Amino acid sequence: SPEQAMRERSELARKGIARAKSVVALAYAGGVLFVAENPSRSLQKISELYDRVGFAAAGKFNEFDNLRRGGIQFADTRGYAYDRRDVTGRQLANVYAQTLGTIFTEQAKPYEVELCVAEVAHYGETKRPELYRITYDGSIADEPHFVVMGGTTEPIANALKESYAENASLTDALRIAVAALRALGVASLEVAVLDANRPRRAFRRITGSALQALL
Amino acid sequence: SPEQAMRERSELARKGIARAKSVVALAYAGGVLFVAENPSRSLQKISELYDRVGFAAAGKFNEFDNLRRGGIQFADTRGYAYDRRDVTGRQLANVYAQTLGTIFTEQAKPYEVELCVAEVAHYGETKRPELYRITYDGSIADEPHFVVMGGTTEPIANALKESYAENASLTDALRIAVAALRALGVASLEVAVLDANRPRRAFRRITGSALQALL
């Protein structure tokens, strides 16, 4: 059955994403904080998509890495074609949802990835940071608080739920996220922040000695 | 079932790589020492990809031969396109993992090859040798000490682990590697080194009289 084939494809994607590390992105005082357990240093599941837009993913690495590359190309095309400020995370997430639904329908193999799009207020401007969660089939979800992706999302999601606090300070939100994700060491983790206080490029990583001191 | 099709494909690649000859590459005092047993003089399992980047593989010779070739054109194109120093083993391993996933996914016949990507510090520069092992489906792993290609990887891997010494001299590293690999003669072997002390091209081979005197 075509319905049977689609259900098999969906369960393939869910089980692929299930046997994956957990990535969390939360809105805190300084914007959006990216946390992902990434033991490999060369591999990076967190990246920047635009000046005030970051990239988070949970799934097969080359899949969402190719998706990230294509999205960066599209965002650069959009910025150069029209204006730097004409690039928004909403349109990026819309393009990604289009592409994921397309591929999932047409590709013999679905992608077992989960993609989160984070956008923050421009520098010298106030706006609540936006979190867009996109499913493998294009099901986009707008999260006002936090996005949990990969692995057992239920325990960490609940722990963040009671542990959620808006405009949380950097270190406090960090330790809250560490406690929720535990449900680790300074290494084996990936940390980045979308900082609205940045004049142009909000994205920034916090690793190593800085990451140690923040813990 | 698509699941059973993927299972038989992956097990086919597994049988190919297991039923294949063994290659070991280790980080030692002089950089990376490449050890692959090779009775055939014409057929080569070790090669240079870049000035400080070599090539290692385990599987069907034509498969990784064409893959090594394509990677060589890609690396030369990147070096000429931007700069020679802008080419890194990380990006090469990323491209290899992506194209291996592509071949596994759409190409009806999987490659029964499993590759190792090595990069050393530039001359007059300190940086630990980097080892990237990629398998048929693109599952890349970063090994800081040693990478074993194909064959009965378990006894040889355990012997290496017990006898691996960081910054081992080339003689000691060679004798450790051959003792682990026995678990052959001067013939039926291929020895190559990515020597950081090389000004530009770290790669170099040691065979015959040099290999004999070294043994």
Binding site: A20, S40, L43, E112 | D137, S139
Partner: peptide
């Protein structure tokens, strides 16, 4: 598949 690589998921980490």
């Amino acid at each position: 598949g690589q998921y980490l």
